[PDB]
Design a binder for this molecule. Structure first.
Ligand SMILES: Nc1nc2c(ncn2[C@@H]2O[C@H](COP(=O)(O)OP(=O)(O)NP(=O)(O)O)[C@@H](O)[C@H]2O)c(=O)[nH]1
Ligand SMILES: [Mg+2]
Lengths: 22, 178
């Protein structure tokens, strides 16, 4: 019984993902 | 300091480890396959109203990285052992390779067994291509039995492409630690 939110990306070494931050 | 979880993702090359991580953390899906050596994702989630930092560590599925890969395992809280539901070879490598490697370095760390590319299991072309090589996709009961055999906390199925069951994978990894 745990309430877990979707993630918010803070940082990544991965180019594709880092580009979608903030 | 904010509560933190280190999760390491392992499994054969091409099972979908990088797309799993990209899709979960950003809701995007990369258009081209680039093999991973190492990569990292730092993401915040709220767990019952309290912030938690997720340190997600991506590893190389290839055999040529066997000697470096375990150097990323210290202080791991939970492993995701991944196999593609439409690749029986990758499934067999859970028992032959991934479970023995993780247990050798980290005998007490929880494991989540993850079946990837759920969207392809019902795909007629994928089915026929497997059938031509006397193979069949991995079924839910098969995955479940493999999870029991390796002592995994949980068996889960997902698609990075459609995001079906994707969030549940990481929620369960969190639950295995917190
Ligand atoms: N249909 C489908 N294809 C997927 C899915 N996830 C990944 N793929 C595809 O499978 C291929 C490999 O994915 P990738 O995440 O790069 O695999 P990996 O396990 O990280 N490989 P490596 O160990 O070499 O870094 C790519 O063509 C990717 O688009 C999925 O959920 N569905
Ligand atoms: Mg990868």
């Amino acid at each position: 019984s745990m309430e877990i939110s979707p993630p918010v990306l803070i940082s990544s070494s991965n180019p594709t993902a880092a580009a979608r931050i903030s | 300091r904010m509560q933190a979880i280190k999760c390491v993702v392992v499994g054969d090359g091409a099972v979908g480890k990088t797309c799993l991580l990209i899709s979960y953390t950003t809701n995007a899906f990369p258009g081209e396959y680039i093999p991973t050596v190492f990569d990292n994702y730092s993401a915040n989630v709220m767990v019952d109203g309290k912030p938690v930092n997720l340190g997600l560590w991506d590893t190389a599925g290839q055999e040529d990285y066997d000697r470096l890969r375990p150097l990323s395992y210290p202080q791991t809280d939970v492993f995701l052992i991944c196999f593609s539901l439409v690749s029986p070879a990758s499934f067999e490598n859970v028992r032959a390779k991934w479970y023995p490697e993780v247990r050798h370095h980290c005998p007490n760390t929880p494991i989540i067994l993850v079946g990837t590319k759920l969207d392809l299991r019902d795909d007629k072309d994928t089915i026929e291509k497997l059938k031509e090589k006397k193979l069949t996709p991995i079924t839910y009961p098969q995955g479940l039995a493999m999870a029991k055999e390796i002592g995994a906390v949980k068996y889960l199925e997902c698609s990075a492409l459609t995001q079906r069951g994707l969030k549940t994978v990481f929620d369960e990894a969190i639950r295995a630690v917190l």
